[PDB]
């Protein structure tokens, strides 16, 4: 264990006097405990990779042996804390040292072990009963919003011999003593799980429920299914908080996890301020999203492997919580930075630049990363179910969709949400292009719509084809001079203007537009498309023989109805009863056909 | 028959990437298979790649992880990899390495065959000329695929190539009209499991799961076993063809992942690179994958391959499409522009080509006017595209009557001929009649690709 430390070709250093060890095994170096792991091995000596300035490291210095590869530790107390790429509790570090710099080689467990928690056993398991992995044996009230169920890890089974009673147990306490065949084992409420793999699941089921989104746009037009995969572009100033905040507050998801590399502290202070401000009043009271979310971020000062592995760590945490029987949403920010980190790692290891400097296996790694999603159901007694969704941000170089990473991300993902800076300076919130953004999840949710509302799909198709018709006729109406066009073209243009100014807008800060429910969305859609339908139907009826109706007559006759259509958003569903809103729709429609009949 | 007790050595002199070196190995057996016992007890597997002196480098199928130079063990088989084959495997599902997935048993293996296979005697080959009934007008009539041939389909991300595979494996038939049926073989290549589920469901839609030899492999699985899986599937096809007198519709998917895995292995082995950094022997490897096909003397069976592949960046000069084009005869090249035009089946007819028209068609099989109809249609479509390009700038005013006729012909060609639908099987005769109706718009004089006799015989209708 007396590391025969050599120099460096950078940070990388090799050494000798190493007993039996395996590649990718964590190792501390020197009396300062600089972190690393094995890269290569040979004979008795092995090369290793350190992740810190190697200055001050002398020859022959000790190396601490470990017994695990790159791994994360998980248990009660993880929710609401802040970490980094190698799972280090920087909050606890500032609490322990009160300094403004990173102490090199922190020997601090991510979970403070001096904290007590209130544990209640299952009450169903008995002494001498046989249990396997994935099976809940107790619970702990980590926070008033989410119940942290505790279950056995995988690859472990045996007959229980002792059950700790309910009480007040710290992190180091033992609760289970399981006698496997001929051997015994110890079990606390913290567990260690390596990172470069997926915990096995019993089965994968198809996605059969929409992902709720507060914004009515992106939901009734280009939906994302719960448990799906999405790609959002990322540009300086185009607007990314507009979706992140809305997803964190207004969402049917159960837990939020935000990761990233090469970011600022500004978003961190923003979410700090959003702890009270963006609170959800499920019980009419202010509870912090901190209880419902966990943060992890890294600056570009952090080691390259920390940036590389934080993205895997996000999936590991999401897996741990989807095992509990919950629904997770992932904010995999700054994927291009991850690609650059991988390129730097390959440059360190002297691989060949397969394409544009990026390594050969980038696409394969991305595919493996996006494999971890969907709705599943895991090993256990109650047969719970959960899901995991991913939202990876992509930063193309100036919008060019040609560098390999964006092409791969477009290829693997199904639904793309478009953003624009033209619309951004057009004071349009949120910005969506409507022509490059697409979806592929309509087929899965067909039965859901057919069962619940039964009019969503036809109205949605009418909406999108009307928008496409506007896009097509824009060039013709520009060419002619915007003074000669058939009446049906006029009504299509006008309803495009109305669906623009009315249905495709929203102000978050406005109290009544903070949340738009799905039923409100489909009600607006049905009302507007039915109005357009009766409009061009009557126009086609009267255009040929006599009493040729023009839009001026329609406007002067239905001006009150146009004003009502413009102003019908002012509803405030929180206060106004929903049944009253549906009755309002009914009487508005009543006025619609009355006016259309009286026109003829 | 091998009455030699097995061996096992613990002398692991190193590990570098996916490679492992074994010193003091006694009399290495090249191209061997070994099994590895990790310290915690998990089993692993690999094949010996290189031997020199008392050293033996060995690559691991599932990937290096956790191997300890002092604790792990390795045991030696002394025989090249031989896979279990069986005729009862039809209707089953396995992973890439061949183990059961459906809680099925270890297959009772009618024989043990070489994974690398063997070549075929040249003189023991017979040319195939039987036309297959696909039910797609763009295939039957333009790029008709015959038995004993290996046409792939060049597709990109988001294209409906999976549905094309479904249709071709569903509406298979014989143009020349006892019963017939095709023993489907399919192996995934790390594709996302949604497409695997869709293929499974469509295969029950066929209603003949009893003739579906299926293999699977997902993205999250180790990358390097993708080098093995297609060879195992091809060995199964060989066994079912030349030992059981059956026809097999072998189909693959996503050869780009195979190319990537081979690239990673080559990079680990630091061989001499080539174009875009690909391995030099990728061509010979692809040859060993594809040329295992056809039908031979003394056997009524045959091998048909449809190895669809991903086409990155829609670039025809990308090495993988190029080399796949060289090694094979034909291509399809599903189009992105047509799919963005919202037309199905979106197969571009021009870049596609089939080399088996030389004997698959002609008098006595389909008709005495198939080839000249197809040649005339190709010429008319190409010139229609050219005049469309001219019209893109010149404007309709300066054109002539011929230009408008060509544009109208192109419009008819796209709206009617290509538009075929998802479940409307069509006969050869109907496609020929449709093509003749399309061609009828042009008077006889400007038809420069039809002989006089056929033109006088068939046109005036």
């Amino acid at each position: 264990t007396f590391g025969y430390v050599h120099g460096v070709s950078g940070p990388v250093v090799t050494a000798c006097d190493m007993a039996g060890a395996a590649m990718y095994e964590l190792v501390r170096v020197g009396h300062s405990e600089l972190v690393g792991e094995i890269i290569r091995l040979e004979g008795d000596m092995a090369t290793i990779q350190v992740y810190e300035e190697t200055s001050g490291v002398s020859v022959g210095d000790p190396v601490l042996r470990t017994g695990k590869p790159l791994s994360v530790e998980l248990g009660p107390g993880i929710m609401g804390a802040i970490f980094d790429g190698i799972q280090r509790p920087l909050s606890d570090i500032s609490s322990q040292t009160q300094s403004i710099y990173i102490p090199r080689g922190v020997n601090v467990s991510a979970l403070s072990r001096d904290i007590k928690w209130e544990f209640i056993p299952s009450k169903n398991l008995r002494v001498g009963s046989h249990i396997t992995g994935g099976d809940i044996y107790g619970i702990v009230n980590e926070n008033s919003l989410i119940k942290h169920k505790i279950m056995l890890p995988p690859r472990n089974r045996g007959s229980v011999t002792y059950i700790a009673p309910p009480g007040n147990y710290d992190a180091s306490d033992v609760v289970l003593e399981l006698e496997f065949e001929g051997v015994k084992e110890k079990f606390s409420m913290v567990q260690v799980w390596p990172v470069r793999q997926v915990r096995p699941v019993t089965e994968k089921l198809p996605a059969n429920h929409p992902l709720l989104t507060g914004q009515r746009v992106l939901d009734a037009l280009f939906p994302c299914v719960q448990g799906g995969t999405t790609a959002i572009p990322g540009a300086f100033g185009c607007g990314k908080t507009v979706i992140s905040q809305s997803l964190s507050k207004y969402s049917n998801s159960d837990v939020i996890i935000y990761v990233g590399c090469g970011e600022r502290g500004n978003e961190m202070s923003e979410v700090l301020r959003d702890f009270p401000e963006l609170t959800m009043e499920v019980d009419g009271k202010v509870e912090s999203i901190m209880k419902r979310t966990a943060l992890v971020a890294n600056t570009s000062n952090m080691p390259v492997a920390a940036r590389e592995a934080s993205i895997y760590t996000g999936i590991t945490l999401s897996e741990y919580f989807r095992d509990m029987g919950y629904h997770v949403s992932m904010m995999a920010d700054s994927t291009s930075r991850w690609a650059e980190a991988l390129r730097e790692i390959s440059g360190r290891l002297a691989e060949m630049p397969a394409d544009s400097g990026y390594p050969a296996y980038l696409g394969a790694r991305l595919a493996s990363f996006y494999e971890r999603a969907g709705r599943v159901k895991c090993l256990g007694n109650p047969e719970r179910e959960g899901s995991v969704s991913i939202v990876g941000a992509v930063s193309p170089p100036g919008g060019d969709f040609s560098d390999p990473v964006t092409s791969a991300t477009l290829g693997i993902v199904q639904v793309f949400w478009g953003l624009d800076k033209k619309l951004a300076q057009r004071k349009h919130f949120p910005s969506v292009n409507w022509l490059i953004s697409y979806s592929k999840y309509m087929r899965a949710l067909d039965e859901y719509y057919d069962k619940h509302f039964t009019e969503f799909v036809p109205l949605r198709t009418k909406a999108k084809e009307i928008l496409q018709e506007e896009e097509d006729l824009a060039e013709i109406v520009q060419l002619v001079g915007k003074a000669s066009l058939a009446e049906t073209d006029k009504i299509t243009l006008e309803v495009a203007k109305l669906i623009k100014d009315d249905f495709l807008q929203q102000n978050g800060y406005t109290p009544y537009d903070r949340f738009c429910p799905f039923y409100k969305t489909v009600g607006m859609l049905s009302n507007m498309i039915s109005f357009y339908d009766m409009a061009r139907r009557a126009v086609e009826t009267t255009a040929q023989s006599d009493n040729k109706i023009t839009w001026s007559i329609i406007r002067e006759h239905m001006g009150e109805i146009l004003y009502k259509l413009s102003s019908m958003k002012f509803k405030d569903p929180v206060k106004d009863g929903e049944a009253k809103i549906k009755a309002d729709y009914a009487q508005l429609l009543e006025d619609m056909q009355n006016a259309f009949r009286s026109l003829e | 028959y091998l009455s030699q007790p097995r061996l096992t050595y613990k002398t692991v002199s190193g590990v570098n990437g996916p490679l492992v070196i074994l010193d003091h190995v006694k009399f290495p057996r090249y191209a061997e298979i070994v099994h590895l016992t990790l310290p915690d007890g998990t089993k692993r597997s690999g094949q010996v790649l290189e031997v020199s002196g008392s050293k033996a480098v060995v690559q691991v199928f599932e990937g290096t992880s956790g191997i300890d130079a002092k604790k792990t063990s390795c045991e030696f088989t002394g025989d090249i990899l031989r896979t279990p084959v069986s005729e009862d495997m039809l209707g089953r599902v396995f992973n890439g390495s061949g183990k059961p997935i459906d809680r099925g048993p270890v297959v009772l293996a009618e024989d043990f065959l070489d994974i690398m296979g063997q070549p075929i005697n040249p003189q023991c080959r017979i040319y195939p000329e039987e036309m297959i009934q696909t039910g797609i007008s763009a295939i039957d009539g333009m790029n008709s695929i015959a038995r004993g041939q290996k046409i792939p389909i060049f597709s990109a991300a988001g294209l409906p190539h999976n549905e094309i595979a479904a249709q071709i494996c569903r509406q298979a038939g014989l143009v020349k009209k006892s019963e017939e049926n095709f023993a489907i073989v399919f192996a995934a290549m790390g594709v996302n499991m949604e497409t695997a589920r869709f293929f499974k469901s469509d295969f029950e839609e066929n209603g003949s799961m009893d003739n579906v030899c299926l293999f699977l492999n997902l993205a999250n699985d180790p990358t390097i076993e993708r080098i093995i899986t297609p060879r195992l599937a091809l060995t199964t096809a060989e066994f079912l063809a030349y030992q059981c007198e059956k026809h097999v519709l072998v189909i693959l998917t996503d050869m780009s992942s195979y190319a990537e895995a081979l690239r990673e292995v080559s990079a680990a082995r630091e061989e001499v690179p080539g174009r875009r950094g690909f391995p030099g022997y990728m061509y010979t490897d692809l040859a060993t994958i594809y040329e295992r096909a056809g039908r031979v003397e003394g056997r009524n069976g045959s091998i048909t391959q449809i190895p669809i592949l991903t086409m990155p960046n829609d670039d025809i000069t990308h090495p993988i499409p190029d080399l796949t084009g060289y090694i094979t005869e034909g291509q399809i090249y599903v189009d992105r522009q047509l799919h963005n035009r919202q037309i199905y089946p979106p197969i571009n007819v021009l870049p596609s080509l089939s080399r088996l028209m030389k004997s698959a068609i002609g008098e006595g099989m389909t008709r005495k006017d198939h080839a000249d109809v197809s040649n005339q249609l190709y010429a008319c479509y190409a010139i229609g595209k050219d005049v469309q390009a001219m019209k893109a700038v010149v404007g309709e005013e300066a054109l002539t009557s011929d230009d408008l006729l060509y544009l109208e012909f192109l419009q008819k060609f796209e709206k009617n001929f290509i538009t075929q639908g998802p479940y409307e099987n069509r006969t050869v005769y109907e496609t020929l009649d449709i093509g003749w109706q399309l061609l009828r718009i042009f008077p006889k004089e400007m038809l420069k690709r039809i002989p006089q006799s056929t033109l006088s015989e068939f046109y005036p209708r």
Binding site: A350, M352 | E270, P273
Partner: peptide, 18 residues
């Protein structure tokens, strides 16, 4: 890059002659 890598490895293996 590949050519330079090859010659660098050649120099290295020559260095470890003894």
């Amino acid at each position: 890059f590949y050519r330079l890598k090859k010659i660098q490895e050649k120099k290295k293996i020559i260095k470890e002659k003894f």
